[PDB]
């Protein structure tokens, strides 16, 4: 025998899962039931719970458990028992077909997943239909099985091979005639049952999505006529409407090429056009369910025929009546309707942009302005709105979505023509405030893209904005400020408007809800007009000093400092270093105050960061850098602040971020900070392993790696930082638990291998780094994997790069040692992670590493790759001999790195 859980124990656990008075008692039962599902005991327990049929809770748990075991643990079943499990599942769904629909889907999903993994069940669709089609009570669950079976063909949670999946799809296509014939019988029998038609529609759309239905046979098929028949009738409920809408969208989306499926395309095209009457009927009854459904059908129709709309507009399947349907939907007062079609308008603009033909553009010009006219009305705030427009709720994100869409479609109208059009509608009619606000919002979207040569109509709009009194609505003042920020180029070309614009932005800067928008606009004027801004610099510094007392958001304050730093860099070298110590002291003194106290230096660290980041003056003739002097004044308080909050990863992160831009700004200068910073970095990293010290070290190596006097100190820093790093990675699941450490470690190693490779390759710490690099390729992490692959790529490239250099033969020899001891292991680990461990996003990075290995020694790579292919688990025909052979041929006989990537895509696809 053996220890097994008993039926009484699981029934008591299932009851406790739903009905335990102690709320912690049901999470205690949930944990144990989860342990049961992942155990070998779950097979028999689920079967017996489904045979007893005690209640809905126990039967649902058993059905879900059966599904999970079949899709995750099918190897636990002996092949001898596959047929017994199928018969049991078919028996269970028969007995429980009326107990609960949610139980039936789980059993249907189990039957589907079982068939997909049981090739001995040949023609399962045929056996299922000619066993249950004659019983009207068995049709509901028969359709459920036939609905979820195509869905599970591409289930990520199943991991069937690409070769097996091709067998499945062409076997399901062979029986597509019988499932279509079953659906026609399902509408002849009980065709008035609304629930029956929904099951017929969901099954039809599922087989459309799989792409196995006959196009010409479905074109002349009554199922498609019934589909549009119910979408015309007003009496159809919301459930049947959604089922029919999804199926029409599935049929339209199933047409990937309009000429191959021309008879079907014409039938669908004619069908949706007849739904316009039903659309207006749905709008009159305020049935927002159907309205959104029709807009999805309309949007998908234009998506399916987007090629014909652009190629032959106004003729045949390019008939512009399709766009007229979308413009009708754009007229609906609810903005949730028009935003359904926003993706199509992007594609239309993208395709119209490709065809560099202004004659084709002119065909659609009217349709875009007609759409833009509707989008401007949707952006209108309510007439009783209080303050500035929201930018974080549903209506705020919609306005930002419209702003991006108008920027991408404005070329079809002409930015200059559309800008003056919106501005002319503002003078006449005495518009309400919410209308003037929305029109100003659209104008701000296209202001950056209008040619600033036609000054008259442009410079007079800017002139009218600064003359706005404070009596105007807050939202109108808010949007007008952002418009000025977008018109920074018209100010640079007409410099006489600088003072009126700066003055107007000053007033909004001194108001609370306009402070952020005014700081953003001031920043835009600073970066664009930084030439003739030396006069207004003194005023900017005054704002930079008393910056903290302005009710500015952290982003607005940083952006305001960025603008002041840009105009400062254009000043003479004397005035730069003079004003820089002042602007930093107001942040330095505040940092000293925090050392005598909540005390959160994040704000003042970020303010020092943005100052160093954008203070890049033209230093020539061997002059001293103005920021170097300020770095030595700033260093002690930074080191003091860093040592206090050394345990807080967030504050340390902002400290190193400020130190990053400080070193970047000065460059090889400020070498005095090398010894005290590196010393503090190693000491703090010994107790608290913040990965940002590895990144900060990479900046030092990137900035001082080429100077021979620093290569030893940097190598000592690397050997020092690697001791606590390896202990962090040697822990169980250390790679998965510390991915940021893996990321920043090979950022440091990459900067080392490209600034001083001979120093690293001839050291002792390069051996553990190489071993961790090969081990880190298994880590499923976007930033970590990109950093590791980049290191391996540049490490191997060292034996090829700069063949003109004096030390080329030494690098070639040093890389040959790495190739001999680790070359075969690297190719095998790279092939292993691509097929089993990593998602497809890593393939271009892996391909670049494989490409570099072929550059160093191509014939030896052919041998290493042939070995890794032979010793590869060719099982999920998982990998045929021709597929192994073609892969080795495509990689080794590749002339570009792209060919290695394409070979990885095809080969790696076989394992998922």
């Amino acid at each position: 025998e053996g220890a097994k859980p008993t039926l009484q124990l699981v029934y008591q656990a299932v009851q406790a899962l739903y009905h335990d008075p102690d709320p912690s008692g049901k999470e205690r039962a949930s944990f144990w039931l989860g342990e049961l599902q992942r155990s070998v005991h779950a097979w028999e327990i689920s079967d017996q719970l489904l045979q007893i049929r005690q209640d809905v809770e126990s039967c649902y748990f058993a059905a879900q458990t059966m599904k999970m075991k079949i899709q995750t643990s099918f190897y636990e079943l002996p092949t001898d028992s596959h047929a017994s499990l199928r018969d049991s599942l078919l028996t269970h769904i028969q007995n429980l077909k009326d107990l609960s629909p949610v139980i039936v889907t789980q059993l249907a999903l189990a039957i589907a997943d079982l068939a997909l993994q049981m090739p001995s069940w040949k023609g399962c669709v045929q056996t299922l239909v000619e066993k249950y089609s004659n019983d009207v009570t068995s049709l509901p669950f028969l359709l459920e099985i036939l609905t979820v079976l195509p869905e599970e063909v591409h289930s990520r949670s199943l991991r069937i091979g690409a070769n097996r999946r091709t067998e499945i799809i062409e076997d399901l296509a062979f029986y597509s005639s019988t499932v279509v014939s079953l659906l026609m019988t399902c509408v002849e029998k009980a065709g008035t049952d609304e629930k029956m038609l929904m099951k017929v529609f969901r099954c039809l759309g599922s087989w459309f999505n799989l792409g196995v239905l006959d196009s010409n046979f479905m074109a002349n098929n009554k199922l498609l006529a019934l589909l549009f028949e119910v979408l015309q009738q007003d009496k159809t409920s919301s459930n049947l409407h959604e089922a029919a809408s999804d199926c029409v969208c599935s049929a339209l989306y199933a047409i990937e090429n309009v000429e191959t499926n021309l008879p079907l395309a014409m039938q669908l095209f004619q069908g949706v056009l007849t739904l316009e009457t039903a659309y207006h009927m749905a709008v009159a009854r305020e049935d927002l369910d159907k309205v959104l459904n029709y807009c999805r059908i309309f949007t998908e129709l234009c998506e399916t025929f987007l090629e014909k709309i652009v190629c032959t507009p106004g003729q045949g399947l390019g008939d512009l009546r399709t766009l007229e349907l979308l413009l009708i939907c754009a007229g609906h007062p609810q903005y949730e309707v028009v935003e359904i079609s926003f993706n199509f308008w992007y594609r239309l603009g993208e395709h119209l942009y490709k065809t560099n033909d202004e004659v084709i553009h002119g065909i659609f010009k009217a349709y875009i302005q007609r759409l833009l006219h509707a989008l401007a009305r949707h952006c209108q705030l309510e007439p009783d709105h209080e303050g500035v427009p929201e930018e974080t709720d549903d209506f705020g994100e919609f306005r930002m979505r419209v702003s991006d869409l108008v920027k991408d479609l404005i070329f079809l109208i002409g930015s200059m023509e559309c800008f003056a059009q919106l501005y002319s509608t503002l003078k006449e009619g005495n518009p309400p405030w919410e209308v003037t606000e929305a029109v100003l919002f659209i104008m701000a979207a296209i202001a950056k893209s209008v040619d600033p040569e036609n000054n008259p109509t442009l410079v007079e709009v800017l002139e009218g904005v600064v003359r706005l009194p404070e009596t105007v609505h807050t939202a109108v003042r808010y949007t007008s400020i952002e418009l000025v920020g977008e018109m920074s180029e018209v100010v640079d070309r007409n410099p006489q408007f600088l003072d009126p614009v700066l003055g107007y932005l000053m007033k909004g800067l001194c108001e609370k809800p306009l402070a952020s928008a005014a700081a953003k606009a001031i920043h835009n004027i600073c970066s664009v007009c930084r030439d003739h801004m030396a006069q207004h610099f003194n005023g900017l510094l005054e704002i930079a000093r008393s910056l903290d007392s302005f009710l500015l958001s952290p982003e607005a304050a940083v952006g305001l400092l960025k603008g002041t730093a840009l105009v400062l860099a254009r000043l003479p070298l004397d005035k730069i270093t003079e004003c820089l110590s002042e602007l930093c002291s107001v942040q330095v003194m505040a940092l000293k105050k925090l050392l005598s106290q909540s005390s959160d230096p994040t704000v003042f660290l970020d303010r020092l960061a943005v100052i160093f980041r954008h203070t890049n003056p033209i230093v020539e003739n061997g002059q001293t850098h103005p920021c170097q002097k300020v770095i030595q004044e700033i260093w002690p308080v930074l080191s003091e602040t860093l040592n206090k909050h050394r345990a807080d990863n967030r504050i340390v992160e902002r400290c190193c971020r400020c130190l990053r831009f400080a070193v970047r700004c000065v460059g090889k200068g400020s070498a005095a900070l090398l010894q005290p910073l590196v010393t503090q970095m190693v000491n703090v990293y010994h107790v608290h392993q913040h990965s940002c010290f590895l990144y900060l070290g990479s900046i030092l190596v990137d900035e001082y790696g080429m100077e021979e006097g620093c290569r030893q100190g940097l190598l000592d820093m690397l050997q020092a930082l690697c001791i606590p790093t390896f202990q962090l990675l040697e822990q169980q699941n250390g790679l998965q638990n510390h991915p940021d450490t893996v990321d920043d470690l090979f950022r440091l190693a990459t900067r080392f291998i490209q600034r001083s490779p001979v120093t690293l390759l001839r050291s002792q710490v390069v051996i553990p780094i190489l071993q961790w690099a090969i081990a880190s390729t298994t880590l499923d992490h976007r930033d970590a994997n990109c950093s590791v692959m980049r290191f391996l790529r540049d490490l191997i490239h060292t034996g090829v790069a700069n063949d003109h250099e004096e030390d080329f033969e030494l690098r070639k020899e040093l890389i040959g040692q790495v190739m001999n001891q680790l070359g075969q292991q690297l190719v095998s680990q790279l092939l292993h992670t691509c097929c089993f461990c990593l998602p497809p996003y890593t393939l271009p990075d892996v391909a670049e590493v494989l490409w570099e290995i072929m550059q160093v020694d191509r014939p030896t790579f052919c041998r290493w790759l042939e070995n890794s292919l032979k010793g590869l688990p060719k099982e999920t025909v998982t990998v045929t001999h021709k597929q192994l052979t073609d892969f080795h041929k495509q990689v080794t006989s590749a002339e570009e790195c792209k060919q290695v990537c394409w070979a990885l895509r095809d080969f790696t696809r076989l394992f998922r």
């Binding site: 994040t602 967030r650 992160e653 971020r657 940002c692 940021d740 990321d743 950022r747 990109c786």
Partner: peptide, 9 residues
């Protein structure tokens, strides 16, 4: 969110 790195080259 507070962690910021430099982009690729």
């Amino acid at each position: 969110y507070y962690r910021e790195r430099s982009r690729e080259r």
